[PDB]
Write a protein that binds this ligand. Sequence first.
Ligand code: HEM
Ligand code: HEM
Ligand SMILES: *[C@@H]1O[C@H](CO)[C@@H](O[C@@H]2O[C@H](CO)[C@@H](O)[C@H](O)[C@H]2NC(C)=O)[C@H](O)[C@H]1NC(C)=O
Ligand SMILES: *[C@@H]1O[C@H](CO)[C@@H](O[C@@H]2O[C@H](CO)[C@@H](O)[C@H](O)[C@H]2NC(C)=O)[C@H](O)[C@H]1NC(C)=O
Ligand SMILES: *[C@@H]1O[C@H](CO)[C@@H](O[C@@H]2O[C@H](CO)[C@@H](O)[C@H](O)[C@H]2NC(C)=O)[C@H](O)[C@H]1NC(C)=O
Ligand SMILES: *[C@@H]1O[C@H](CO)[C@@H](O)[C@H](O)[C@H]1NC(C)=O
Ligand SMILES: *[C@@H]1O[C@H](CO)[C@@H](O)[C@H](O)[C@H]1NC(C)=O
Ligand SMILES: *[C@@H]1O[C@H](CO)[C@@H](O)[C@H](O)[C@H]1NC(C)=O
Ligand SMILES: *[C@@H]1O[C@H](CO)[C@@H](O)[C@H](O)[C@H]1NC(C)=O
Ligand SMILES: [Ca+2]
Ligand SMILES: [Ca+2]
Ligand SMILES: [Ca+2]
Ligand SMILES: [Ca+2]
Ligand SMILES: [Ca+2]
Ligand SMILES: [Ca+2]
Lengths: 141, 320, 320, 288, 143
Amino acid sequence: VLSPADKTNVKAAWGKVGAHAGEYGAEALERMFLSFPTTKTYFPHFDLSHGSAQVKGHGKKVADALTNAVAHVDDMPNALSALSDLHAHKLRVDPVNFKLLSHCLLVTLAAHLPAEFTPAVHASLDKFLASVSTVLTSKYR
Amino acid sequence: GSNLEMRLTRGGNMCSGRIEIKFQGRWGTVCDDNFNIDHASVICRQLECGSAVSFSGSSNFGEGSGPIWFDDLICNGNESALWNCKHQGWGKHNCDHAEDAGVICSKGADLSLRLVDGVTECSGRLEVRFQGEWGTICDDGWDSYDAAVACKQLGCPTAVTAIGRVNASKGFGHIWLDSVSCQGHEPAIWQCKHHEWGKHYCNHNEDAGVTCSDGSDLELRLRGGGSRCAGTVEVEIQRLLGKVCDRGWGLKEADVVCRQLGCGSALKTSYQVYSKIQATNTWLFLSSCNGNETSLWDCKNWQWGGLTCDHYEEAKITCS
Amino acid sequence: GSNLEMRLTRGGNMCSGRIEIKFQGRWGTVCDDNFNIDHASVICRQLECGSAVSFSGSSNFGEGSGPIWFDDLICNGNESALWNCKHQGWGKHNCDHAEDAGVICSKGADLSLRLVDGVTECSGRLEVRFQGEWGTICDDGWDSYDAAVACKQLGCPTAVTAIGRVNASKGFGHIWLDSVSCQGHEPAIWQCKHHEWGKHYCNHNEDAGVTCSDGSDLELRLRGGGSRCAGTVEVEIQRLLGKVCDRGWGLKEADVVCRQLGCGSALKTSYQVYSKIQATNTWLFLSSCNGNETSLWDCKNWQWGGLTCDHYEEAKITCS
Amino acid sequence: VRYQCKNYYKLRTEGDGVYWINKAVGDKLPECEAVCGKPKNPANILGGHLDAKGSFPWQAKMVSHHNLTTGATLINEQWLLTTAKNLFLNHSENATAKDIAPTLTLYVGKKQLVEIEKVVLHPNYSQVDIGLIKLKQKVSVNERVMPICLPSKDYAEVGRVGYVSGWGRNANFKFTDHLKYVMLPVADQDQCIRHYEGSTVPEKKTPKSPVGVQPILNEHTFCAGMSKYQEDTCYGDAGSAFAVHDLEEDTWYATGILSFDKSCAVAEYGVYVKVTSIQDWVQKTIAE
Amino acid sequence: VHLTPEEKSAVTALWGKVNVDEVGGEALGRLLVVYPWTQRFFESFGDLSTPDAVMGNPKVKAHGKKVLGAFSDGLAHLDNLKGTFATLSELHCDKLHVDPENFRLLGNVLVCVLAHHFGKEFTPPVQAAYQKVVAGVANALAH
Ligand code: HEM
Ligand code: HEM
Ligand SMILES: *[C@@H]1O[C@H](CO)[C@@H](O[C@@H]2O[C@H](CO)[C@@H](O)[C@H](O)[C@H]2NC(C)=O)[C@H](O)[C@H]1NC(C)=O
Ligand SMILES: *[C@@H]1O[C@H](CO)[C@@H](O[C@@H]2O[C@H](CO)[C@@H](O)[C@H](O)[C@H]2NC(C)=O)[C@H](O)[C@H]1NC(C)=O
Ligand SMILES: *[C@@H]1O[C@H](CO)[C@@H](O[C@@H]2O[C@H](CO)[C@@H](O)[C@H](O)[C@H]2NC(C)=O)[C@H](O)[C@H]1NC(C)=O
Ligand SMILES: *[C@@H]1O[C@H](CO)[C@@H](O)[C@H](O)[C@H]1NC(C)=O
Ligand SMILES: *[C@@H]1O[C@H](CO)[C@@H](O)[C@H](O)[C@H]1NC(C)=O
Ligand SMILES: *[C@@H]1O[C@H](CO)[C@@H](O)[C@H](O)[C@H]1NC(C)=O
Ligand SMILES: *[C@@H]1O[C@H](CO)[C@@H](O)[C@H](O)[C@H]1NC(C)=O
Ligand SMILES: [Ca+2]
Ligand SMILES: [Ca+2]
Ligand SMILES: [Ca+2]
Ligand SMILES: [Ca+2]
Ligand SMILES: [Ca+2]
Ligand SMILES: [Ca+2]
């Protein structure tokens, strides 16, 4: 659960992510595809090579979704309702892939924001990504 | 009445907190249903706590215990006590204890505003005092109307009222106000619609500020480009020299600057460098300019400082 | 009473068998619930039978018959009798007679170690005798210290002790001993730290062996490269041909081999073939070693046989 | 002679077992039934508490056709309690219990696969998220397989800590390889409805769940919060019993059956349907 | 599965610059902070409530040093991980009753710590290699 301190840390961390969110998300997608190739089975229509324009655009979309979730941290299920329906029903993405993507997002943020990735901020961002994943994986059946 | 005693619970001081009334010797709360500033005025005047700074209704002061006594209180403001509004019964309510109404009263809140760490007495970080301790304002939702209200409230020029703490660092301590929604006409910054006091997820990097100026000490120029109107935009605001952050800096804002300096349209968002310029750590951040503005100061919500232009360059330009 | 005679029934001799305590004029057994080496050691020191080789609770020693006196005991190891731990109550239990606990003690044990299916009597698959039944040892946690302890125990020149069965096939029977952790000073392989006897997570492909040598019969040459200092690494250990597997075979081990043969450092783990060479079933495996060693035998924990280099390739070298 | 049977079982008869004509009942020849929730080695899912000792013999691992592991709870030697939402995985909303049953796979003990004879859903399974699984033959009760007992009391009083074992997903959203359990305290009911719905009054309730989906909250459910270590139950833990250890008689009771497993760690409370509410129905259903 | 020579070289190159006296303590403290149920196993380590208490704990630092030493030993023996981690897996399964998913969580937290320490030098390729390493360590240390 996201405590007010956790929401504060997440808001600050994503604020300093800032305009680099699109390429942070692209890097996280690249990390997920390399480290965990089983996640590539959900993108059979993407060029999954390094520096792929399609992967870059989808990372931009993912990070925009995460930014909207941070902006609506108190109403994330309503912010991600369309994405929850999408991932859970149309794409049928298994939740383990969501935890893998959350880990790769955390690795990207650690590699790109080392000064601001404190253990408290690491825990807060992990909790926020867990909340996003749970919202997106809930309607999964 | 004559035997009804009410109190304010869990609000810092005795003039703030949940509205709790004693009836049949039981302490019970009041709904937020149909609760507005008139009920808060009745309550604050009833307790001799002054005027009503604010009201709240979602059990923000904690969830109360006991029987909810009132649900739909119709108070027009001039009631001697809360148990004089019409309501709809003594204990009749379609409520929970997440709907307890609380109030914040004038003599308890003891509010005042000030500007700290700015280049002038009328610029810098905006700090509001709530219940005896000073705190800052989150810049979430802080815009030109908020700044205008704050500048008229501190009583010094309201001709141009920018946002953003000009060079002030982060504040310390509490952050009191978040998402202040002023229309520009409110007497003070706490009559405006805003989130509850201290209820936010802001850090002190986000501290709100204003730049109160009588449209006379804002100077803009282009330096480093070998002509008066082709170069890097150098803004001087109350003697503080800075630059424009080129985030959201297209040819619309560029044309606005060129018109302000009087050199036609903007041909290029870059310039042939003739000379170097001084390093200035304070920045000007334009949200979005329509394009037809007579001067850059008339654009909507231009921060003068308070943000970092780290992964963006300074706004350069070449007019005609 | 302090007159509780305890015996071990149906275990071959007096120090091995199923625990059985006489109290209240009747002989009763002990549950295996929370039964570990501590209870075994307590029972073994009760009969002055030495240390505890192992414990058993699957009624392998035979079905019990009588009132189960003990069910759950909390023994830390140092007790003056089994009726001193937190036996959670006398006579009360939740077992049956098939759940009774037995113990094998050092005095009554017939523990022995032997080498089978090796090139010499000093090498082969290591086998350990437990209650008279010969089983094998899993090579998990089997290192040069365990191999040295085994070589010292069996008795034949222990100057060079290598792990891994030499050309030996999968053993059969039980896997009595797993994850042995000797420090090199234990008199025998069973005084070391290891898993509970018979309990393991391995198969007979992982069967541990040992190679005991004085170092005179370990030869290592390069074949197929024309030059004496180029080719595959061919290994002669006890007149047995063999080649080094290249798993965990970097340039450091390559230059160790080059220095052993006396051709400086290593250039590449590949050679331009000059002549065909045959293939040999047994492989030398190099976990890791520092690279400054004057000989390949002297660097730590090299396995000779006991694994197949099928997933990996032969180890090659071209020295200078 | 006297009829007595082995461990984990109690003689089901009227007068002793001395007999072949019995002087008490004649030629009844009693059969002995298993034992309510008395695990050989009792205990003392995002979080930990690895079930190393097999402390929850009643827990069953139910896998659907499309390989989503869920939970079930042995209530007697032949029947199991689960949730209706568990049985309806990979099935139409109009699917019957006749064709749900051949789809399911059930594991008790270590991996002991048990065939399912029939599945019966609660009549009001939209409000009472319960389904009953019947095995083809009675499972053999041992130190790893043993029914939990259905409570004679309501152990759902706020503050009670029951042990929720589970086969569901973990902190990596991976179905757990080993059975786990958490020690969850039952929460204030009003806090739980207010956390999920709006204000515990029907005209002001709103879909306020911190997770996308809404639990089934009514008079037949209670809620247990996360433990002291912020660990809860996640997907696949539904159908697992909120086992309560009654220290008076040292017996384990299925106080609730986990209905809402979508509260992995975001929603503060997992919603358990009260077994005391469904106890009459499950008894009437075992009867036939 | 066998690790390619390039992946092994990347892993070794990045591990050679790892501060063993600090990285293990950082990883264990971050594990305790983010997954607080792992503090259950370290109640003997003293105050572990605040993140600053966990990261400032001398016992957490020493035990993380031991854990990172075990990681280094498994790195020197990547091709034989079940043999090198047999004793530790037995300890964690029987003496400690640590859930195997905690090993995977600590591996992920270690990868996060390595990224936090090495910035862009922790490329997605070397992260994939280290994910293979930590998965092998966790699988060798489990069941
Ligand atoms: C924090 C976690 C995640 C977020 C915020 C997220 C967000 C998004 C967004 C914004 C889109 C764009 C779709 C649209 O705009 O209509 C999308 C699409 C998609 N997502 Fe995710 N997602 C997440 C996790 C995952 C994971 C882990 C996977 C697979 C391993 C996945 C698989 C997909 C697929 C296959 C699409 C379809 C894209 C296409 O077809 O163009 N998502 N997601
Ligand atoms: C994932 C890789 C891990 C490695 C390589 C590792 C390594 C080690 C080592 C070397 C020891 C010392 C053994 C001894 O003292 O005899 C140890 C002990 C221990 N480990 Fe781990 N560990 C890992 C994961 C974990 C996790 C995730 C937890 C808990 C959530 C944990 C809990 C413990 C505890 C409680 C001890 C004993 C504490 C003590 O001796 O003071 N370990 N581990
Ligand atoms: C922002 O700029 C203002 C104005 O220059 C600074 O205030 C000055 O502080 C210096 C001390 O070095 C005094 O000598 C001046 O008299 C002050 N001027 C006024 C008008 O107050 C202020 O310190 C700066 N704030 C920062 C950089 O945090
Ligand atoms: C390992 O090698 C030894 C030595 O070559 C083999 O032992 C010989 O086996 C043959 C039969 O194949 C006998 O005729 C010899 O007398 C044996 N010699 C010795 C010294 O034992 C042994 O069989 C091999 N192990 C295998 C192939 O598993
Ligand atoms: C049960 O699971 C199977 C396999 O996951 C589902 O079959 C898939 O359905 C989707 C959606 O129509 C198709 O795109 C796939 O091609 C199907 N895969 C197959 C048939 O192997 C099935 O729909 C599920 N049953 C439900 C949801 O009622
Ligand atoms: C600029 O154009 C906008 C329409 O986009 C209009 O609303 C505004 O009044 C114009 N301003 C001036 C100064 O003409
Ligand atoms: C090789 O270096 C190690 C240091 O790790 C040292 O202990 C050993 O003695 C050295 N060996 C030789 C032969 O120099
Ligand atoms: C479920 O898993 C089994 C094997 O575990 C496999 O044979 C089957 O195809 C899987 N079904 C689906 C829908 O994934
Ligand atoms: C289902 O609901 C009805 C009325 O809501 C009730 O009378 C009936 O008992 C319920 N079913 C069971 C099995 O209790
Ligand atoms: Ca209301
Ligand atoms: Ca009302
Ligand atoms: Ca802001
Ligand atoms: Ca037992
Ligand atoms: Ca027992
Ligand atoms: Ca092995």
